[PDB]
C-alpha cells in the first residue's frame, strides 16, 4: 500500500463570508487581520505591476483559516464564461472615483475599492450606493467631503465642478466599530483625490493593523 494526497479548493467568496458574518459591528480585530491580509497581497501585486481596477468584493476569497486571497485580475482575463450583463452598470460602490471618472488603474484605485469593502465588512452592508457614476460620487462625497473644480484629476469624463461642495462625515462614527486610526486609514483610502490617499504598503505597515 502506497500513500498519496489530494486537496480541496476553497470557494468561500467574501460575499458569502459577509452573508454568514454577524450584524454591523463586525469584530474590528478580525477585520484588522483581514485588512492586512488584503494589503499584503496588494504589495505583491503592485511589485508585479498587476492591473485589476475591476476587482470587486466577489473577487476576494476568504479562506477557512481567515486568509484573504485575491483573484480575477481585471476584465482582460476574467468572465470568459457566463457572467453578469451589468458588470459596470451595477452599483459601483466598490469602484474608485477614478473608475467612475473613466481614468485607469492605480494603487489608490485598488485601495479605494477595498476601503469601501472594509467598511462593508464592519457594516455587513455596502458603504455607498448611487445610480450613475456621477450619482455614485454624489454618495461617496457625503462621507469623504467634496470640493469644487480645483481638486479634481485631469482625466475626468464626469462634469467636474458640477458637484456641490460638502463636508465629510467622521468615518469613525459612520462605520460600526471603526477605531479612529482605521477611520483615518479608510478616509485616506476613500479620499477623492488619488494623490491624497495612502499606499498599500503604508497602510499595511500602519500600527493599526
Amino acid at each position: 500500500i502506497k500513500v498519496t494526497l489530494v486537496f480541496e479548493h476553497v470557494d468561500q467568496d467574501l460575499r458569502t463570508y459577509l452573508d454568514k458574518a454577524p450584524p454591523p459591528g463586525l469584530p474590528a480585530e478580525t477585520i484588522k487581520d483581514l485588512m492586512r491580509q488584503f494589503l499584503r497581497g496588494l504589495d505583491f501585486l503592485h511589485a508585479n505591476c498587476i492591473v485589476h481596477r475591476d476587482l470587486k468584493p466577489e473577487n476576494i476569497l476568504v479562506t477557512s483559516g481567515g486568509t484573504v486571497k485575491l483573484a480575477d485580475f481585471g476584465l482582460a482575463r476574467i468572465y470568459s464564461y457566463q457572467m453578469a450583463l451589468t458588470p459596470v452598470v451595477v452599483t459601483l460602490w466598490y469602484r474608485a472615483p477614478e473608475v467612475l471618472l473613466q481614468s485607469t488603474y492605480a494603487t489608490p484605485v485598488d485601495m479605494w475599492s477595498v476601503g469601501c469593502i472594509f467598511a462593508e465588512m464592519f457594516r455587513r452592508k455596502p458603504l455607498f450606493c448611487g445610480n450613475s457614476e456621477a450619482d455614485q460620487l454624489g454618495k461617496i462625497f457625503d462621507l469623504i467631503g467634496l470640493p469644487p473644480e480645483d481638486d479634481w484629476p485631469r482625466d475626468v469624463s464626469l462634469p467636474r465642478g458640477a458637484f456641490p461642495p460638502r463636508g465629510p462625515r467622521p468615518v469613525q462614527s459612520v462605520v460600526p466599530e471603526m477605531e479612529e486610526s482605521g477611520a483615518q486609514l479608510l478616509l485616506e483610502m476613500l479620499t477623492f483625490n488619488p494623490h491624497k490617499r495612502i499606499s498599500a504598503f503604508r497602510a499595511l505597515q500602519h500600527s493599526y493593523l
Partner: protein, 630 residues
C-alpha cells in the same frame, strides 16, 4: 605613478585543493569526466580522418576500454583517441582551467559536424577525488610516447614511456585510494556507467576477470543507442519500441511516441512515450520523479521531473537532449532553472497534442483513458491554464450510453433545443446513481445525465463550471430545473398549498434534523428525499472529505451544507400523511412515521446517519410488532 598595474594571480597550491575538495560533491562522477574526455578525443580523430584518412593508419578503431586491477587497487582507462604531444601534456593537461577541446573547436569554426564537450578545462583533476595518484601515458602521431605522473602535490613529471606501446590516444592510471576500492566492483562501475554514459556515441567496454579468470570484454556496457539523434522520418516503430523497452525495462512496448524539437536560443530534441499501462506505484508520494531525463550532448545531467514536468503528466517516459545549456561548474546542476520551466511548457503543449491525436484513435484512446484518466482529472484540478484542453479528453458514462463512455461535446450534441445545462450525478457506483431517485424525473423528461463514479470526480467537477457555453448542474442539489409545463406549474402550486401544513408539521417534527421541508417534482418513485443546498459539500463530497486522514475537522463549519426534505405529492404515503395531519397533526404514531421516513430518506440519499444503532432499534421494534413479540 599614482597607480600600479598587476595581473591577477592564483595560488595553485590552494587552488588545486579547492578543485579536489570543494568543486565536486559526488565522487563517482570521476568516470563520467574521464569517459567524456575520451569521447571527445575519439571525435577529434573522426574529424581529422575526414581530411586525411591516412591518419587512421595508426589505428582505425574508435573505442574506450575500462580495465580494473584489484591486485594493485588501480583502475586503467584506455582511450583510443589522438593523444597528446609532450607540449600538450605540459600546456594543456598540466594547466588549470584550460582545454584543447575548446581550442580544437575554435579550429573547427571552419565548419564541422562535431559535437564536443569540455568548456571548463578542469574535469581531469576530479580524478584525484578518488585516486591517490594519477598517471597518464600517451602517444600522439606527431610525437613520442610519454608518461605523465602526478599525485596532485603541486607538481608533475614527464618522461618518455617504455615497454608497452600505444598506437594512439592515452591511458589513465588511477592509483585508487585505499578506501575507494568499491569502484573496483563490477556493479558499482556499471551503476556509474548507466548513470552518466548510456548514450556515449562510442563503444565503451568493461573488462572483468571472469572465466580462466581473464579480462572479459563487456562490449555491451553501453550498447544503448540514441534515437532522437536520428532522422524521425527514417525511424521505424520497431526501433521506437526497442528504445522504449531499453529505456524503461518494460517487457511490453509503448502505446504512443512523439518527437519534438525546437530551434533558436533554446535548442533540443526529445522523445516522449505514452506507456500502455500505469505502474503500481504511480502515485507513491516518495517516488523519485525521474520519468523524463535531461541530457546535454547525450550526457546525463539531471532527472528532476518535479520541475521539468507537471505532476499530472508524471507517467510519460522520455529523454530530453539539449545542445547548449548554462551548466554549473559541476555539471550535475543547471543554472537558470527558469530554462527548465520553459522546456516544460513546450513539453506540455506537445503532450496535449499527442493526447488529442490519441483521442482520434478511439480504440487505443479508451485504453489510455482507462489507465490514466485519473491523471487527466488531476490536471483539471491542478492546471488552471490547460484545463480547457484537458476537458476535451474527458469521458463519462451517460444515460443513453451502455458501458461506453462519451465526451462532454458528444453530450452537447445530444442536448435538447431548450436544454441550457448539463445534467449529472455523482456517487460511489454506476448502479447506485442509476437507481437514484434524483434522475428518475430527469429520465421522464427525456434527458440524459452524466454519471460520475470516482471520488476524484468531486474535485474535477468542482472546476468544470462551464463547457462549450453550457452550464452544469447536479440533480442532487436544490434548485434543479426541469421543463416546466405551465399547467403543471399551476398544479404544483395547488399541491404546495395542499401539502403546506403537512410540510410545516414535518418541519416541527424534524426541526433540528432538516433545514426545509417542501415538495418537488424531481422525485418519481420516492415519497421523499434529502437534497443539498447549492452552498457547501454534497452528500458525496461530505462522505469523501470525512474519510481524509489529514483533514482539519474545523473546516466543516464552512462546508456543512443544509439539508432539505423533498416531498413527492403523488405517493399514497404522502397523501396519507396529509390526511393524517388533518385527522390529528399531533398523532404520535404519525410523527414517528415522519421520523422514520426522514432517516430512511437521509440514509438512502447518501448522507451520514447520526446513529445506525438507534435507527435499527426502531426497525427492530417494528419487526417485533410484526412478529407480535411485544
Amino acid at each position: 605613478e599614482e597607480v600600479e598595474t598587476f595581473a591577477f594571480q592564483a595560488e595553485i597550491a590552494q587552488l588545486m585543493s579547492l578543485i579536489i575538495n570543494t568543486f565536486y560533491s559526488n565522487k563517482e562522477i570521476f568516470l563520467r569526466e574521464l569517459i567524456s574526455n575520451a569521447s571527445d578525443a575519439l571525435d577529434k580523430i573522426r574529424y581529422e580522418s575526414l581530411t586525411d584518412p591516412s591518419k587512421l593508419d595508426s589505428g582505425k578503431e574508435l573505442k574506450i576500454d575500462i580495465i580494473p586491477n584489484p591486485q594493485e587497487r588501480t583502475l586503467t582507462l584506455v582511450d583510443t583517441g589522438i593523444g597528446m604531444t609532450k607540449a600538450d601534456l605540459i600546456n594543456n593537461l598540466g594547466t588549470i582551467a584550460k582545454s584543447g577541446t575548446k581550442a580544437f573547436m575554435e579550429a573547427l569554426q571552419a565548419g564541422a559536424d562535431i559535437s564536443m564537450i569540455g568548456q571548463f578545462g578542469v574535469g581531469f583533476y576530479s580524478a584525484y577525488l578518488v585516486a591517490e595518484k594519477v598517471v597518464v601515458i600517451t602517444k600522439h602521431n606527431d610525437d613520442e610516447q610519454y608518461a605523465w605522473e602526478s599525485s596532485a602535490g603541486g607538481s608533475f613529471t614527464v618522461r618518455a614511456d617504455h615497454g608497452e606501446p600505444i598506437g594512439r590516444g592515452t591511458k589513465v592510471i588511477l592509483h585508487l585510494k585505499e578506501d575507494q576500492t568499491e569502484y573496483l566492483e563490477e556493479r558499482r562501475v556499471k551503476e556509474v556507467v548507466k548513470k552518466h554514459s548510456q548514450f556515449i556515441g562510442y563503444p565503451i567496454t568493461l573488462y572483468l576477470e571472469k572465466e580462466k579468470e581473464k579480462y572479459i570484454d563487456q562490449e555491451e556496457l553501453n550498447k544503448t543507442k540514441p534515437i532522437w539523434t536520428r532522422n524521425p522520418d527514417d525511424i521505424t516503430q520497431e526501433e521506437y519500441g526497442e528504445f522504449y523497452k531499453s529505456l524503461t525495462n518494460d517487457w511490453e512496448d509503448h502505446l504512443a511516441v512523439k518527437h519534438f524539437s525546437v530551434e533558436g536560443q533554446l535548442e533540443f530534441r526529445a522523445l516522449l512515450f505514452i506507456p500502455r499501462r500505469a505502474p503500481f506505484d504511480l502515485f507513491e508520494n516518495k517516488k523519485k520523479k525521474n520519468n523524463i531525463k535531461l541530457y546535454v550532448r547525450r550526457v546525463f545531467i539531471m532527472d528532476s521531473c518535479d520541475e521539468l514536468i507537471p505532476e499530472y503528466l508524471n507517467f510519460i517516459r522520455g529523454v530530453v537532449d539539449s545542445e547548449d545549456l548554462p551548466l554549473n561548474i559541476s555539471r550535475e546542476m543547471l543554472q537558470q532553472s527558469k530554462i527548465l520551466k520553459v522546456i516544460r511548457k513546450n513539453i506540455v503543449k506537445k503532450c496535449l497534442e499527442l493526447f488529442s491525436e490519441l483521442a482520434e484513435d478511439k480504440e487505443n484512446y479508451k485504453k489510455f483513458y482507462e489507465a490514466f484518466s485519473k491523471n487527466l482529472k488531476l490536471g483539471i484540478h491542478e492546471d488552471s491554464t490547460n484545463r480547457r484542453r484537458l476537458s476535451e479528453l474527458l469521458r463519462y458514462h451517460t444515460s443513453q450510453s451502455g458501458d461506453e463512455m462519451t465526451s462532454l461535446s458528444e453530450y452537447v450534441s445530444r442536448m435538447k433545443e431548450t436544454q441550457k445545462s448539463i445534467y449529472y450525478i455523482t456517487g460511489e457506483s454506476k448502479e447506485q446513481v442509476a437507481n437514484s431517485a434524483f434522475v428518475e424525473r430527469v429520465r421522464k423528461r427525456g434527458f440524459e445525465v452524466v454519471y460520475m463514479t470516482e471520488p476524484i470526480d468531486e474535485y474535477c467537477v468542482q472546476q468544470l463550471k462551464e463547457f462549450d457555453g453550457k452550464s452544469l448542474v447536479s440533480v442532487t442539489k436544490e434548485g434543479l430545473e426541469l421543463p416546466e409545463d405551465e399547467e403543471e406549474k399551476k398544479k404544483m402550486e395547488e399541491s404546495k398549498a395542499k401539502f403546506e401544513n403537512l410540510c410545516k408539521l414535518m418541519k416541527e417534527i424534524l426541526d433540528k434534523k432538516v433545514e426545509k421541508v417542501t415538495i418537488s417534482n424531481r422525485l418519481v418513485s420516492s415519497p421523499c428525499c434529502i437534497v443539498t443546498s447549492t452552498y457547501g459539500w454534497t452528500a458525496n463530497m461530505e462522505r469523501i472529505m470525512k474519510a481524509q486522514a489529514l483533514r482539519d475537522n474545523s473546516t466543516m463549519g464552512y462546508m456543512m451544507a443544509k439539508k432539505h426534505l423533498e416531498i413527492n405529492p403523488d405517493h399514497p404515503i404522502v397523501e396519507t400523511l396529509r390526511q393524517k395531519a388533518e385527522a390529528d397533526k399531533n398523532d404520535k404514531a404519525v410523527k414517528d412515521l415522519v421520523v422514520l421516513l426522514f432517516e430512511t430518506a437521509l440514509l438512502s440519499s447518501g448522507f451520514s446517519l447520526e446513529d445506525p444503532q438507534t435507527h435499527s432499534n426502531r426497525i427492530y421494534r417494528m419487526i417485533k410488532l410484526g412478529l407480535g413479540i411485544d
